[model samples]
Target: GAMGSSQPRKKIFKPEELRQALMPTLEALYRQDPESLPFRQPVDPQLLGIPDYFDIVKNPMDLSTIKRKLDTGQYQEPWQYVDDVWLMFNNAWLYNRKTSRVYKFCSKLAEVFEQEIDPVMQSLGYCCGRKYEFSPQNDTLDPEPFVDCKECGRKMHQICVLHYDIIWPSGFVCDNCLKKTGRPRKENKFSAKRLQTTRLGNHLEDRVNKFLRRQNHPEAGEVFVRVVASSDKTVEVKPGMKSRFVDSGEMSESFPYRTKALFAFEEIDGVDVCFFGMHVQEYGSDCPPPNTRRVYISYLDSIHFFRPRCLRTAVYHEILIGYLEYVKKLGYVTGHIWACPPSEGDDYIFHCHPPDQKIPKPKRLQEWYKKMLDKAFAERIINDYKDIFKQANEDRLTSAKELPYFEGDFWPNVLEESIKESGKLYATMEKHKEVFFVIHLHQPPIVDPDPLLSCDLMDGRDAFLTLARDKHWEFSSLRRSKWSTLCMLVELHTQGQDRFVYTCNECKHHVETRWHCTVCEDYDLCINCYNTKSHTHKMVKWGLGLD
Candidate 1:
């Protein structure tokens, strides 16, 4: 046995001593595999070919995870650490077939632990707890240092004292004395730190629910809002997931679209009702603007095939508003979000959703998103195009005289300048693709306009401008300008139509690809109605796009 390598049997009386003694046992287990075995890292069920691994095995633990928990002092007793060790081996055995290659590897590690680690743990008893009958002096090494309660003169761990959410102004008070006295004064609501219940604790969750309740939005009150990305880390927002995503991080170089993807989810009834991730990227300029970041919102409408129509009008809108506010914290000033619904043959938004009726297709989804953007503009959540779009509109209106006919991935057929001279910009949206919503109405006004605030960023931009005006103009030509997506989609779908345009007479909303009855004089069936075969007469699928 490797127990022959043991030095003097150093007793672990304090927490530090416990750590010192137990590290070797953990280190021995780590050495047995040392990243060679499957147990070294967290298990990936998909990659490991264990589709039902989780259904059978409830708890998943790994060597790397155990070390993290151990280093963070997560275990109060040495026995807790032992239980985790057993769990790691236990899960592998339970999930893997008995004669499988992976199970044999775990068997070897568990056997090593039994031989070398068991004796060490038994010897290191009370590593995290008090040992002596009488309290030792400061000079004596009976155990670890202890802080005496100010009121009662009872000694306790210094680390334990820091758990005081409602501290006494006089001095440090023990739990017994504090409990008897209760809180002395009003609790400090200003310092909004929370306990580590998987981070962003239920305390804040309760508060947000309270805000929703106060605002008379009980439908949205049941929502559990979770942030998966911030400055420090990007976590997994999947509901009921125990672990965080193993961070694979990088910085965006030049015009990187996939930079710093921030996500927030609305979990309800142990399922994500509304899950959306915001794509953050840098928008550059010759002026080298401060806070010139753009956020493109990608919303997965439904997780399952079943319940394809997750509540949108009340729920998703609230999430979007909160998201718009959250991005501001990340220094995203210029906001852009896509309102483009998936095309035909596109799959349902799946994490997982059901089988009842067929899920709504692209044209129907396109109509729903169109209404969403309209409501966003109405609520003043998204910047109205006409307000923030003047400079770009002015540019387009001015440029139309020189370049009358235009064709590109953007708007193709440029309308005559004479018709658009009434301070309006005209664009023949060819791509007729994604709809973009502007977050900010305009570039925020420069506060001081101080030249002293100039830095290396502006210098680089200045250097960039000196090359050729046409060189920078390539990216500009990709799109006509930062034209409003909502306007383009509206123009493309409802251009030469009547006042009702494509408004579903049943649902009373502007639907893009409306279903109209040739038999009925003035009737349009919305997708909801069309799905149920609810129309009185045979209806025709309306395709609103001309080109």
Candidate 2:
């Protein structure tokens, strides 16, 4: 036994006892955590290229290191051991914000850790069932051991020489010496250059706020240009849809669904008035193939500065830019829209315009969509995107079609190359909606990016920070209705003219977008059943007649 084990006299659970009591809990947690992947090792700052990691994390801890500390008996009380585990998770929180897949895993593991260790914690003198306060125990013995810092021979312990090779080792240069004074800060521009976050791009807010200031927004301050794009649903499938899986790679977390929403408004005194909102569903298409992946835009708009007359551009500019960037992130080469205008459509939310001021006559609405498409197609490649994400998802929409013809020369020329990729070109048609299908001829796989991610959305606050801190980006935090108004908003938007009860008659499953037949006076089928060709008669899309 050493005193931090040097012949412990009347210690709080001898090093052997403490180790025995703690080992099983730590071992169980280590075993149960599926592969214990990211939390298993100490973060390699230079390896990950997260140069600011050391600055952001004061003390980084991990599962493997905590086990090493246990083997060497570095902890005196059980609480000290537990705190290191807490530190490991909190360190991750400081770096990766919400939506990053890694962030959720840490929270998942930490929750498991809490439950696993509860028994062991209460078994010790902490039996009062409280969090911090331990029931009276003599924690008075055993002086903590420390190694010397090279600069100032001060006793540096666990927080010092990080998980030493030897239990009581020497000559390990401590943190204080490594970071003495005049900390020469290194520029993390290395990542920015690689990710192209260094590229110049404009934000909608610049134009949005410019309008507010120009018009002298009498009742409000600057209208915040807010946007959020989220992809939902499990990377799962029903039996019939199995063939839909391309032999390429597994589906992404946000694969089954997608959403892009924007809310623009200003706050005055205490009241808030929202003047514009644009919603884009990662709208899908009923293709010829089973689960043949196809996602386009069910893009919508509403601009009511006061339910009356107004200006445009700023809102339209931001909305289109938001779609362009969001679609880029999801890796799309071609896109489409269900361009049936509100005036020609029904009374449903999606069938009606959000901007109460506009008549939204069929041709006018259809014209605006063409203008945006013309703008997206004008350039050979999107310069705004080759600006943010490292590896480009795609640079251009190969072909956008209405009846039979495409708008640009670029998409048509690209079609020849698309067929060459696999001899199987990709494109789909749905509902015969107004020619909004910016349809992808083929969506080549874009490599997953980890290059320095910073939202250059041009909003004052950091995008990563706003994602984690609900108060910043959340609708509810602003004293609005619910937390996920967007999900409900998307639901209403997508279901607008979709009249199906959306239940699969074959499998009895609930389908968001479905196929139907007339003989039963009405019988529905999910994508899987319809694709399975389960029916003798070709089933038609719910509202769209005869297949």
Q: Could you give candidate 2's per-residue lDDT for residues 267-362 as a string of tens digits?
A: 433233444555443323322221233344443544344312343544465456545654555465444455565443232121122323456666
User: Root-mean-square deviation of each candidate, in angstroms?
Assistant: 26.1, 28.3
For each candidate, the alpha-carbon lDDT, in order, equals: 0.44, 0.46
Evaluate residue 526 in candidate 1 and report its C-alpha lDDT on the 0 to 100 scale: 69
Task: Give residue 324's lDDT in candidate 1 (0 to 100).
Answer: 49
lDDT (Cα, 0-100) at 89 in candidate 2: 74
Over 4 Å off, model 1: 1-211, 214-221, 230-253, 256-293, 298-301, 304-312, 325-333, 343-383, 386-434, 442-547
Deviation of model 2 at 474, angstroms: 20
**lDDT top scorer:** 2
Residue 339 displacement (Å), model 1: 2.2
Query: Any idea what lDDT model 1 has?
Result: 0.44
